[PDB]
Ligand binder design. Structure first.
Ligand SMILES: OC[C@H]1NC[C@H](O)[C@@H](O)[C@@H]1O
Length: 558
C-alpha cells in the first residue's frame, strides 16, 4: 500500500459545455468553472477532471480536436486556462485534463495534409487503405454508426475512424506520430496540469493487416479494438518519455477491455497508467451487442462486479469508482429511484457507497444535487451523435421499432448527463443569461444548488459530510474491501478494514423496511453517518432495522 494524493482525492468531473456560462452564448466556459471553485471547495473536492477544452468543431463536443495547442473558442482563452490552474492551486485543488490522442478532428492540420495526396508527408499519420472489391477494406463497424471506413474520392482510398467520420484515427505505429503526441503532452503538462485522463486509451494499437472480424467478434467489436499487439508497448513508451517525468495522476478510460486484461494498464510495476476507469459496473445492464438497449439487473450482479473489479486491481493496481459521467445516464435514475418520493434518499444512498469504495471516487457535475435523467420524448430532442448513429443503424433500417428504441435510449443516452447544471431557480436554472445550448431539465425548480447549499439535510450537504468523513478516515480510502454477502439482492453491506479500524457500510436497496442481522459476531461501536433513518442504533447492536433506501456507515467493535 503506497499512499498517493490521487488515491485519497475526491475528484469532481466538469463537462465545461454544460457547467456554467458567463458570456450569455448558452455554452459553459472556463470563466464559469473559475467562478464556481468556491462552491466546489465548499463541497470538499480535491481535484477536477475537465472534459476536452481544445479547439474543436464539436461534432463530438470536444472529442474531435482541431488544434491541440489552442483553447476551444467557446471556452475562452489560454489566459483563462492559466487562471483556472492558478485559482485551483490557491485552493489546493489539482486539475486533470482529457487527452484525446486515439484520433483527431478531420479538420486537424495533420489530417488536412494527410488527406491531400498519397505522397503527403502526413499521409501516414492516419490509416488509409484501398477498397476490397469496390467495398470498404473490411467489416469494421464504427461506435457512432455505420462503417469505420470512410471513402475519400480524391485519393481513392478509405480512412479509418472507430468513432465519427470526423474523428480519423491516428497511426501510432508511425514513430513521428508518437513523438508529436508526446511533445503535445509536454506543452500541457508544463503549464502545471496535475492529471491526465486518456480517452479510449486501449485502442491506440491497430490490428495488423486489418482482417475482417468474425460474426462473433462483430457482436463485441469494442473488445476486438483493444487487442492491438503494441498497446502496452506504446502506453509504456509514453510513460518512459513523458509521464514518468512529472508527479501526475493518469487515468485510463479502457472501454471494451475485458476486466481480466485491465490490470496490464494499471499495475504500478508496469509503468503504464495509474487509475483504472473500468466500465463493467456502469454498463452492467447494457446489451453488449445492441449497445443502446438496457436490461434488468439485480443488486447481486452489481456487487459481484464491484468485488471482481476490486480483486482485479488487487495489491498493485488502483481503481476509480463512479456511477455516472458524461457518457451515461444520471446515477440516481440508473441505480437509484428518481421518482419524487425516492430521489433524495436514494441519491444519498448512492453517495454513501460511492465515497466509501477502495478506489478514487469521481463525482459527476450535478449528481451531488441528485440531478436526474432528462424527460426525452422524440428523437429530435437528442444532440448526441451516438444515439443518432444507433437510430440510423437500428431504426431507420427497420430492425427495431422507433418506440421501443426510444423507450431504451431515454434511459441510456449520454445526453441525460449533458443538460445544463442546475444552479438555482431562476430562468434556465442560472446556468446562462442567454439560451442554453441544450435544454435545462424542467425539474430545476425543485433541484438546484442554491436551494441545497443552505439546507443541512440536502443531497449536496450529505455529499459534503461524506467527503469530510472519507478525508478523516484512512480505512475508507485504503482499507480492504469485504462484501458480507455477494448474493444478497436487497441489502448491500461491506466492510472497509485497516488493522483494528473496521467500518461497515450498509445500503437498503429495497423500498420496504428490512431487518439485517450482521454476520460473524460483528457488532457496532458507533454510527459514523446515516441517511433516511430515524431508528436508534446503540453500542453493541448486531442487527439493523433499515428503512427504505436507508444507508449508513458504522464503526465496528474490535
Ligand atoms: O472520443 C470518443 C469517446 N471516447 C470516450 C469519451 O468519454 C466519449 O465522450 C467520446 O465520445
Amino acid at each position: 500500500t503506497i499512499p498517493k494524493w490521487w488515491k485519497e482525492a475526491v475528484f469532481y468531473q466538469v463537462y465545461p459545455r454544460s457547467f456554467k456560462d458567463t458570456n450569455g452564448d448558452g455554452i459553459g466556459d472556463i470563466n464559469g468553472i473559475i467562478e464556481k471553485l468556491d462552491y466546489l471547495k465548499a463541497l470538499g473536492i480535491d481535484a477536477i477532471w475537465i472534459n476536452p477544452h481544445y479547439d474543436s468543431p464539436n461534432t463530438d463536443n470536444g472529442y474531435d480536436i482541431r488544434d491541440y495547442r489552442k483553447i476551444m473558442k467557446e471556452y475562452g482563452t489560454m489566459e483563462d486556462f492559466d487562471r483556472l490552474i492558478s485559482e485551483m492551486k490557491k485552493r489546493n485543488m489539482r486539475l486533470m485534463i482529457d487527452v484525446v490522442i486515439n484520433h483527431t478532428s478531420d479538420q486537424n492540420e495533420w489530417f488536412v495534409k494527410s488527406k491531400s495526396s498519397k505522397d503527403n508527408p502526413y499521409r501516414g499519420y492516419y490509416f488509409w487503405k484501398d477498397a476490397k472489391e469496390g467495398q470498404a477494406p473490411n467489416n469494421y463497424p464504427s461506435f457512432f454508426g455505420g462503417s469505420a471506413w470512410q471513402k475519400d474520392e480524391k485519393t481513392n482510398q478509405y480512412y479509418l475512424h472507430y468513432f465519427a467520420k470526423q474523428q480519423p484515427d491516428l497511426n501510432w505505429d508511425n514513430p513521428k506520430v508518437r513523438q508529436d503526441l508526446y511533445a503535445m503532452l509536454r506543452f500541457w503538462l508544463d503549464k502545471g496540469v496535475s492529471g491526465l485522463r486518456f480517452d479510449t486509451v486501449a485502442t491506440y494499437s491497430k490490428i495488423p493487416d486489418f482482417p475482417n472480424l468474425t460474426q462473433q467478434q462483430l457482436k463485441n467489436f469494442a473488445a476486438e479494438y483493444t487487442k492491438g499487439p503494441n498497446i502496452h508497448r506504446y502506453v509504456n513508451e509514453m510513460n518512459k518519455e513523458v509521464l514518468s517525468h512529472y508527479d501526475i495522476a493518469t487515468a485510463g478510460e479502457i472501454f471494451g477491455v475485458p476486466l481480466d486484461q485491465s490490470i496490464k494498464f494499471f499495475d504500478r510495476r508496469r509503468d503504464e497508467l495509474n487509475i483504472a476507469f473500468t466500465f463493467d459496473l456502469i454498463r452492467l445492464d447494457r446489451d453488449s451487442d445492441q449497445r443502446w438497449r438496457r436490461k434488468d439487473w439485480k443488486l447481486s450482479q452489481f456487487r459481484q462486479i464491484i468485488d471482481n473489479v476490486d480483486r482485479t486491481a488487487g495489491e498493485y493496481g488502483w481503481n476509480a469508482f463512479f456511477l455516472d459521467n458524461h457518457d451515461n445516464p444520471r446515477a440516481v435514475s440508473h441505480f437509484g429511484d428518481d421518482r419524487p418520493q425516492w430521489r433524495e434518499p436514494s441519491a444519498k444512498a448512492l453517495a454513501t457507497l460511492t465515497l466509501t469504495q477502495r478506489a478514487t471516487p469521481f463525482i459527476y457535475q450535478g449528481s451531488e444535487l441528485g440531478m436526474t435523467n432528462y424527460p426525452f420524448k422524440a428523437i429530435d430532442e437528442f444532440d448526441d451523435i451516438e444515439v443518432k448513429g444507433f437510430w440510423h443503424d437500428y431504426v431507420e433500417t427497420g430492425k427495431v421499432k422507433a418506440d421501443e428504441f426510444l423507450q431504451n435510449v431515454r434511459l441510456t443516452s449520454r445526453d441525460n448527463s449533458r443538460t445544463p447544471f442546475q444552479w438555482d431557480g431562476s430562468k434556465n436554472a442560472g446556468f446562462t443569461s442567454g439560451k442554453p445550448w441544450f435544454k435545462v431539465n424542467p425539474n430545476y425548480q425543485e433541484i438546484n444548488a442554491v436551494s441545497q447549499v443552505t439546507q443541512p439535510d440536502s443531497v449536496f450537504n450529505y455529499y459534503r459530510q461524506l467527503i469530510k468523513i472519507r478525508h478523516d478516515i484512512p480505512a475508507l480510502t485504503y482499507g480492504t474491501y469485504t462484501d458480507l454477502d455477494p448474493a444478497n439482492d436487497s441489502v448491500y453491506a461491506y466492510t472497509r478494514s485497516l488493522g483494528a479500524e473496521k467500518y461497515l457500510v450498509v445500503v437498503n436497496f429495497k423500498e420496504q423496511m428490512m431487518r439485517y442481522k450482521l454476520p460473524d459476531n460483528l457488532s457496532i461501536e458507533k454510527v459514523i453517518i446515516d441517511s433516511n433513518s430515524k431508528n436508534v442504533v446503540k453500542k453493541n447492536d448486531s442487527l439493523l432495522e433499515l428503512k427504505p433506501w436507508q444507508s449508513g456507515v458504522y464503526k465496528l467493535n474490535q
